[PDB]
Structures are given as C-alpha cells and as structure tokens.
Ligand binder design. Structure first.
Ligand SMILES: NC(=O)c1ccc[n+]([C@@H]2O[C@H](COP(=O)([O-])OP(=O)(O)OC[C@H]3O[C@@H](n4cnc5c(N)ncnc54)[C@H](O)[C@@H]3O)[C@@H](O)[C@H]2O)c1
Ligand SMILES: NC(=O)c1ccc[n+]([C@@H]2O[C@H](COP(=O)([O-])OP(=O)(O)OC[C@H]3O[C@@H](n4cnc5c(N)ncnc54)[C@H](O)[C@@H]3O)[C@@H](O)[C@H]2O)c1
Ligand SMILES: NC(=O)c1ccc[n+]([C@@H]2O[C@H](COP(=O)([O-])OP(=O)(O)OC[C@H]3O[C@@H](n4cnc5c(N)ncnc54)[C@H](O)[C@@H]3O)[C@@H](O)[C@H]2O)c1
Ligand SMILES: NC(=O)c1ccc[n+]([C@@H]2O[C@H](COP(=O)([O-])OP(=O)(O)OC[C@H]3O[C@@H](n4cnc5c(N)ncnc54)[C@H](O)[C@@H]3O)[C@@H](O)[C@H]2O)c1
Ligand SMILES: Cc1csc([C@](C)(O)c2n[nH]/c(=N/C(=O)Cc3c(F)cccc3F)s2)n1
Ligand SMILES: Cc1csc([C@](C)(O)c2n[nH]/c(=N/C(=O)Cc3c(F)cccc3F)s2)n1
Ligand SMILES: Cc1csc([C@](C)(O)c2n[nH]/c(=N/C(=O)Cc3c(F)cccc3F)s2)n1
Ligand SMILES: Cc1csc([C@](C)(O)c2n[nH]/c(=N/C(=O)Cc3c(F)cccc3F)s2)n1
Lengths: 251, 262, 268, 268
C-alpha cells in the first residue's frame, strides 16, 4: 500500500544505475507506481540498466533535440500505457552542457553553439516535454524536473549554472500551462550527487544542518516521489530543495 | 495504511474547527498518527472542539508566553506518550498580532508592547517549542511551523508580516539545533485561509478581499481560501519520511501564487 | 562638475530616441562622461538619432552575434578614445526575442532556433561584451547591463523572461572575471518602459488580448510601486545606470539594482 | 559641487569614530550635506567624537526606546534647522543585540526580554524614526538604514540575524508610508566592518571560539567577494549610503543595496 499506488508515471534520464533518474524510478516502483521510461542515444545500454529496476517497464526512445521524437511521444506513450489511459506524473531528469561551458575551461571561452546546445537540453526541453505530455495527463498530475541551485555563481559549473537559472524560469511558465490541465509543475534542487569541485562538495555537508551524503541519491528520489504524490497538492511553479538544507546556511 | 503510521506528533494551535491546526490534526489522524494536542487559554472550549476529531488525543495546556508551561512541557508530553517514547513530529500553528499591528490601524501607530507580544507568540515561540521538545524527539523527526509569505509587503497584514519574516529567520537557526538530533525544521507558507479570524475597518476588508481574489487568479492551479485541506496535507508531507533532505526551508502551499506576477 | 566627469564610457543599444540607451547616454553626457557608442545594423539611422544627444560621440558597429565584430571591438574602441586610454564604463542595453517567444504566441510554440537567438543576444552577449572590453578597462570600472525582473512568471514576456533569468546568472559569472581587473558588474532591473516595441503591443499590434495583458501589467506596476512608476519616462532608469557607472557604489558587484519604483517589494 | 549639495540630512548612530554612522556623516559633509546628528546614552563621549567631523552639526538626544524623545524629535530637529526648512535625508545606523542573543551563547538560551530589546532597537526603531521624521521631510527625500544579510543562518549572529530579517520587512512597509511623502526607504546590507564590538571579538574578548568564527567569516567574505572585502574600511559602505541619499537612485524603494564586495552573489 504505497505512496504512488496505481499512478502512471513517465521517467526520463536513466543512462546508468547511479543516475538520479534510476533511483527516482526504483523508489516510484517500490511505492506502487507503474512506469514508462525514456532514454537517449545508448538505448542498448539503457535497456540493460532498466532491467535492474524491481519491475518491468517499457523503454521509449527520446532525444529532446529531435522534433520528430517529441511530436510522436504522446502517441507512443499512449500505445505503451494503453489507449484511454493517461499519465499522472512526468519526471524530467535530463541535463548536459559541453565541456567548454562546464569544468576547467574559462567562462568566457565557451562558444555560443555549445552553450545553446546545453540550454536546449538542460532547460528548453523541460517545456518541450510538458508540451508533448500535458495533453495525455490527468487532473491532479505532477511534472518534476531536476535543478542545481544557480542563485549564486560558483567555480566550474559556469554555463551549466546559467542553464539551470533558465530552467527555473522555464518551470514557472510550464506551471501556467500545466495549471490548465489541473497539473502541477515543480523542480527538486538537489545537492551534488556522485553519479574546486571537491571543495564545493565538501562544503555542502558542513553547511547542511543534517549533513549531505553525495554518494546517496535516495533522499533526492524520495523528494521527487513526494512531489509526484497527492501530498503536495497546492505547490506549483516552485522549487523544493533536497540539499540537506545547505542553501539555508552561510557557514 | 497511512502516511504517518505509528508516528507520535504534537499539534498546537487548535482553537476552532476551522483552525488550520484542526485540519492538520484531522489529516494526521486519518493517516495513522498518534497525536498530543496543545491549547491556549480557552481549554474547556478547545476540548469541545477536539472531540470532533477522528480519534482521541490528550490535550495539554501551553501558553508560549508562559515560562513554566514551556519548562514543564517535555515532561507532560512524556507522561502523555509514555516513558521510553519520544515524538517524531511537532507542529507550531501559533500566531497572534494585536489589533494595533494588524488591520486598518496605521502601521506607525502600533506600540512596541503590542509588536513585541506579536513577535514573541508568532516568531520567538518557534524557538521555544523547539527548545522544549527537541530533547524528546526521535531521529528522522520533523518540526513544522506555519508561515505567510512576507517577502513583499502587503496592505493590512502590517506587523504580522514583520513577525513572519522573523519566523523564517528563526526557522533557519532552529534547523541548526535540530540537525544535532537528526531532526528537520521547516515552514509551510500557506495562501490565505478563511478561519474565524479572517472571517472577521472598511478599507481593510476591501484590501484583504483584493489580496485573496488576486491570490486565486495568480495561482496557476487556483486557490480555495475556504479549503484548509491542501495546507494540512502539505504539513503532513513534511511530517512524513518523504522529504528527508529538506531542512531550515519553506514549502509553499499557496496554489503557486508567489511564483507568478500576474 | 558632474557625476561621471572624466569617465570614458561605451554605451550600446541605441536604436531610437526612445531606447533606454539613448537616455543613459544623454544623462551620462550631461554628467561629463565622454562616450563611445555602438550600434547594430542600421548605423545611418542610428547616427541621425545620436546627433540628437547633447554631445557628439564616435559610433562603432557592433552586432553581438558577429564574432569578428567582437574580436575587433577593443582595438576599434582604442582607436576612438586615443591609444594609452581605457574605458571606465560599459553599458549593455541590448535585448531581443523573436515574436515566437514574446507576445501572444503560446509559450510552447516557440521554436528553439528563435529562443536560442534571443538568448544569444539578450544573455550570452553580456559575457561576450565583457570578454572583448575588460582588457581595455581601468580599475574601479563598471559594466552595467539591463534587466527585467524574471523572478516570477508573467503573461506575454515568456521566453524573454527566461532570457533575463539567464542574464542574471551570466552577470554573476561576469562579476568574477571582472573582479580580476578591479571592474564591477551589475544589472539594473527596470520597470516597463514605453520603448518602440512596447508602444506597438499596447494599442493592438498583436491583438486586443495581448494589448490588454500588458496594460494590466503596467497599471499594476504603478500602483504596487510606493513612489509610483512612469512607463513614459526612462530618466529614472538612466540615472540609476549612471549611479552604477560612478564611484558611489564601489562595493557592489554581481548584483541587481532595481529601478522599478519599488514595485517588486510590494505584493499589492 | 558635491553629491549631497545643500541637502539637510539627519544621521543617527555615532558612538565612536569607527562607527559606520561616523563615516556616513563624514562623507555626507564632504559632499556638501548639512547635518543634524542624534546620539544615545553616552552623549558626552559622542559630543567629543562628532567634534572630529569636518563641520559643526547640532547634536540631539535620541534613545529610540524612549517615547518622549520620539514624540519631540520632529520639533527639536525643526528648531535646529530653522522654521520653514525640511529634511531631505535620514540615516538609521542603530543596532543592538544583548550578548544573550549574539555571540557564543546557544541560540535557545536567549531570553525573550533580551531578544525583544534587540528587535526594538535594531528593527522597530526604523519604523519609529520614519513616523517621527516623515512629517518634516521634503519630496524626493531618502531614509536609509543599515542591514547585514540575514537570508542564510550563520554562527554567532543568532538573534541579530533575526532582527535584521525583521528590519528588512519593516523597511518594505516604511516604503509604503514614505511614498505618500515622495520619500524613498532603503537598507544598505554591508559586509563585516571592524567597528568597536567586532574588533573586540577578533582580539579574543569573547574567547577562542567566537574569535575563530568571526575570523572564518571575514576570510571567506574576502574570497567570495569578486572585488574583495576590506573589513577595516567603512568608506565603501558610507559612499553607498550617500548614493542612496542622493538623487541618483530615484526609482528604488522598499529595497536592499548590497555593499558587500558582491560576496552574497557567489557560493565559493
Ligand atoms: N549529479 C548532481 O550532482 C546533480 C545535482 C543537481 C542536479 N542534477 C541534475 O539531475 C539531472 C540528471 O543528471 P544525473 O546527475 O542523474 O546525471 P546523468 O548523466 O545520469 O543523467 C543525465 C541524463 O540526461 C540525458 N540526456 C543528455 N542529452 C540528452 C538528449 N539530447 N535528449 C534526452 N536526454 C538527454 C542523458 O541521457 C542522461 O540520462 C540533470 O538535470 C542534472 O543536471 C544533478
Ligand atoms: N489563516 C490564514 O490566512 C493563514 C495563512 C498563512 C499562515 N497562517 C498561520 O497559521 C497559523 C494558524 O493560524 P490559523 O489561521 O489556523 O488561525 P487560528 O486563530 O485558528 O489559530 C491560531 C492559534 O494561535 C494560538 N495562540 C495564540 N496565542 C497563543 C499563545 N500565547 N500560546 C499558544 N498558542 C497561542 C491561538 O490560541 C490559536 O489556536 C498561524 O501561525 C497563522 O499566522 C494563517
Ligand atoms: N522597454 C522595457 O520595458 C524594458 C524593461 C526592462 C529592461 N529592458 C531592457 O533594456 C534593454 C534595452 O531595451 P529597450 O527597451 O531600450 O529597447 P530598444 O529596442 O531601444 O533596445 C534594444 C537594442 O538592442 C539592440 N540589438 C538587437 N539585436 C542586436 C545585436 N545582434 N547586436 C547588438 N545590438 C542588438 C537593438 O538594435 C537596440 O539598439 C534591453 O536589454 C531590454 O531587454 C527593457
Ligand atoms: N560588521 C558590522 O559592523 C555591520 C555590518 C552590517 C551592518 N551593520 C549595522 O550597521 C549599524 C551601525 O553599527 P556599527 O557597526 O557602526 O556599530 P556602532 O556600535 O558603531 O553603532 C551602533 C549604534 O547603535 C546605537 N544605539 C544602540 N541602542 C540605541 C538606542 N536605544 N537609541 C539610539 N541609538 C542606539 C549606539 O549608540 C551606536 O551608535 C547597525 O545597524 C549594525 O547592525 C554593522
Ligand atoms: C547539475 C549537474 C551536475 S553534474 C550534471 C550532469 C548531468 O552530469 C552533467 N551535465 N553536463 C555535463 N557536462 C560535462 O561534465 C562536460 S556533466 N549536472
Ligand atoms: C497570517 C495570519 C492571517 S490571520 C492570522 C491569525 C493567526 O488568525 C491572526 N493572528 N493575529 C491576528 N490579529 C488580529 O487579527 C487582531 S489574526 N495569521
Ligand atoms: C524586457 C523587454 C521589454 S521590451 C524589450 C526589448 C529589448 O525591446 C525587446 N526585445 N525583443 C523584443 N521582441 C518582441 O517584442 C517580439 C516582437 C518583435 F521582435 C517584432 C515585432 C513584434 C514582436 F512581438 S521587445 N525587452
Ligand atoms: C550586524 C552587526 C555586526 S556588529 C553589530 C553591532 C551594532 O555592533 C552590534 N549590535 N549588538 C551587538 N552585540 S554588536 N551589528
């Protein structure tokens, strides 16, 4: 008798068993949700990985930069869940920024084509996914995406931080559209998960009043399932921080 | 089978059956929680209201301005839940600001005696409750307070808004103390709710009506000010195990109004 | 003697005499700044307009999507201002989102080619300008870009709101780079100003539904603002940008100054 | 010809010549301002200190907790500046939390009697001053208060952080009331400044641990700040206050300007 019993939920973003979306999927199933999964590029590898979930679930291909993939998605989901059935939840757990805009490469050296690809995949796609899927979502449903707090600049993350700032703004507009379908849209801002950079991750655990385990994706997956559930029915266009409370503390 | 099965939860601030705390209590019990209730001043009448709840729960007296009430609280809760047992949740649903600091009385005309009392009860008491009860709380536990978004000023609410701003800062420090016990501390920022207080000058009501109509239109999923259940349910989410990495934070149960400009 | 007496300040984004940049340039000049102006595309149209400023200034061509314009910008500015001289201020007053991303067009119907162009021009370009010009900036210098508060969603602004969220994040990163030169970086978040594009939307050009939305946004701004807001008057915004170009906010960087009548601090 | 030429400005909160208010007063006087000062308790020590300002100014007594001092303030200021004259600027640089609420003491051990005193002095008194002074303020006038960013919890500051949170909210209401007079109300959020009480804690007055926490805070501030942060130097903060009292930020009210080297805009 689980949190998400009899809910139909789409989960994107699994590439490995340490992917945040793997753990979102694992916990959702453990809570009685029936899943449809989406994957990008290495679909052979991803079938392998999704087999490790506790229950079978169909795996659809979705490259968020492919307009055909997006145009046909609602139909393909409906064939996999069965006509007359609709989704109750959608999980966006997709993000990418080329190495020129993330890492040791100076901020000013990122060419715009790279930044733009990163923003397409990491931010614009959240609207793309909601566009495709809202027509096949039931009232009371929920769309959740994955955020990393971009309110302050930080070393290394650079243009990925910019892209997450874009995502948060995207999420607010998607909530206006989702509202029309009685559907909620929110992001979970997670702490750093091991799916300058080490000094940033070590600072997290000390700021977090309850600590932060960067090797454990479960507290993040649980928070996403909270948002997929009926238990936060008045929250939309918002961000829930699953970060051990680190963003609430200066030192 | 319930969201809060076998959890022991203290719930303060029930005065009428339209109190937000009444509805947190009702939903908590529907979800298998075993409750201890606290009440201020009007305890006989408060029993006459809590009788209407789904299950029996002990009612203790607690005036958060009374130092003895606070010093004796851990003990009286421990007598009510049985020695060797500790609370898994605490709900602060306590707020007050005298007429001088809220309504049609000019902002500048509220005396500090009134403002200080308002802040004591509405903000400082969150720290008081956490002090008294953290020693009798289980790891994985959760303290939750009730907030009204004070990020932007608004007509009428005046010094009450100032007090909620204080509360949000208190919440972040209470989170530091609660962390030591593996306990979380969060606030739910509710949209406006028609309790007996809100259902009570002339231009004051008009600005409050404008505030509330504005809330529902801004809220992408709408806002029913007559329905406390969405707020209660959000408080139960936080009392549950499903938000275990969130502390010193604010969850908005406001229909998403605060995320929209128009 | 004036607020910016002796400062050399590059000001971009003049297209008409209702441009926010026109007013920034005017006020800067009234306060003793020596300007270099940059313009996009219609340079002869812009020359006619810049002739209406209190003083003359060199006008250079800068299309922020042109990588060669950017590569040559510092060399060309040095020519204009005299070799051995450097800039003390740079104003980015450049923004653009195609009508597919901003207006009556539904949020979900904006194709990514159009969004990406608008982000290149409205957000990324702030980093581009900083990259090109920081090498010719003096310590205690100031880069100011224009912003429109994207903290909460709103009708019509749509993907321009998203581009301003990006811009806020870019400014925080530009501040880190600018810090190495002793140069500060901030945005001025303005209230709605009746420039060319905003005049068009009100009055029907995109239909009565779009015209009504924006009129409700504007009227709501003035009433929320404790000192009121005059959408017809860019001077208070220009003065704010000049504040930030001066030496009077020397410890503010990576930040946003709101010149919006205080509207964003009030709910109703 | 200076920033505040001929403006009449009340400046509260001078105690020593390292006080933030002392530097605000000095800079305001350097920029041609005509001052009226207010002081608390040790009015003998304060007279001595204010005599070290560049120009003479009337010194009135003001204990913000005294209701008679507030009820008479307007009348006493008027007597000091001349009948038919009004104030253009008011500076609130008054803050206090007893050691039970700030320092090494556990957060939960602050009695409310001490917290309430700190909130009275540090937050409510921003409302009280504006109530007393707005009726003798000119349109285009400015009230400016002092803030320390309370958005995130931090060790030691405890209930003063809470007070600053209440101050920020108070400021947004004061803006509403001041707007009716054509007057702006803003707070300046400063980085840590080595004033009397701070220099003590770093010297070891409060012990090993308080000294080590404040030293960690200051170090981190300077590294987070892209332009750095010199805690010995109050001048950037004083300048920022003067910017706000001037006519150069005329569309900013109910707001917070950060004079913190940009530290609050960077995580690491
Ligand atoms: N790991 C962290 O520290 C952290 C922190 C905060 C937020 N997040 C976010 O969580 C989400 C998931 O990332 P993760 O840490 O689980 O890493 P991950 O590498 O497992 O997942 C990223 C996913 O994005 C997908 N993707 C990339 N390009 C795509 C395209 N063109 N079309 C469709 N999908 C595409 C990949 O297939 C991959 O499954 C991301 O949005 C990430 O930015 C991660
Ligand atoms: N109703 C709304 O619109 C709204 C919106 C957001 C947040 N809130 C907050 O939610 C909480 C609950 O308020 P409500 O709307 O349920 O109104 P309510 O009047 O039903 O409840 C307020 C409670 O505060 C208690 N209280 C007052 N003084 C006390 C003291 N000295 N000691 C202990 N308790 C004391 C009262 O007895 C009462 O039970 C408050 O903090 C309120 O500020 C209310
Ligand atoms: N008008 C408002 O209500 C308002 C409110 C807040 C902020 N802003 C911002 O102020 C800035 C100025 O806008 P405005 O209202 O003065 O309108 P405007 O049209 O006068 O300014 C836009 C300028 O951007 C320039 N531009 C467009 N593409 C360019 C390119 N590829 N390279 C270089 N320049 C290019 C245009 O030529 C024009 O000079 C923008 O950043 C805008 O987003 C405007
Ligand atoms: N690190 C810092 O020093 C720092 C950082 C940010 C903000 N601030 C703020 O700047 C302001 C000035 O503080 P400072 O560092 O110059 O300290 P300071 O001690 O130099 O000045 C504080 C002033 O508060 C006055 N005061 C206390 N109780 C009073 C009362 N009842 N009536 C009138 N005045 C009273 C004192 O007389 C004193 O002049 C305060 O609000 C402070 O919180 C300080
Ligand atoms: C927010 C975040 C942190 S790590 C992360 C992802 C999904 O692993 C990445 N997306 N893009 C990345 N780019 C490079 O590392 C090069 S890493 N996203
Ligand atoms: C935030 C809020 C809205 S209504 C409310 C309470 C708890 O009912 C009140 N607290 N204090 C109140 N004071 C007066 O109305 C007088 S009403 N609190
Ligand atoms: C924030 C803001 C408000 S007005 C503004 C700018 C710089 O003037 C604009 N940039 N891009 C703009 N784009 C549009 O208005 C979309 C649009 C057009 F670009 C052209 C015709 C109609 C139309 F609706 S307006 N930026
Ligand atoms: C924010 C801050 C830092 S030092 C300071 C004051 C005004 O000096 C103090 N107030 N109360 C103190 N104890 S120290 N306030």
């Amino acid at each position: 008798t689980g949190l998400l019993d009899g809910k139909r939920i789409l989960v994107s973003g699994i590439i490995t068993d340490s992917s945040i979306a793997f753990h979102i999927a694992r916990v959702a199933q453990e809570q009685g949700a029936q899943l449809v999964l989406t994957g990008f590029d290495r679909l052979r590898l991803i079938q392998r990985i999704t087999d490790r979930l506790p229950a079978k679930a169909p795996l659809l291909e979705l490259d968020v930069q492919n307009e055909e993939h997006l145009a046909s998605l609602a139909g393909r989901v409906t064939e996999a869940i069965g006509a007359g059935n609709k989704l109750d939840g959608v999980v966006h757990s997709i993000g990418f920024m080329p190495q020129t805009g993330m890492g040791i490469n100076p901020f000013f050296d990122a060419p715009y084509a790279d930044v733009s690809k990163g923003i397409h995949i990491s931010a614009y796609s959240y609207a793309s996914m909601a566009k495709a899927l809202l027509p096949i979502m039931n009232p009371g449903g929920s769309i959740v995406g994955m955020d990393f707090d971009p309110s302050r600049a930080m070393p290394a993350y650079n243009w990925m931080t910019v892209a997450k700032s874009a995502l948060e703004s995207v999420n607010r507009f998607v909530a206006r559209e989702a509202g029309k379908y009685g559907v909620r849209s929110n992001l979970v801002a997670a702490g750093p998960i091991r799916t300058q950079i080490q000094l940033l991750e070590e600072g997290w655990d000390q700021r977090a009043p309850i600590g932060w385990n960067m090797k454990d994706a479960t507290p993040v997956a649980k928070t996403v399932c909270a948002l997929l559930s009926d238990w936060l029915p008045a929250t939309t266009g918002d961000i829930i921080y699953a970060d051990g409370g680190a963003h609430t503390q200066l030192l």
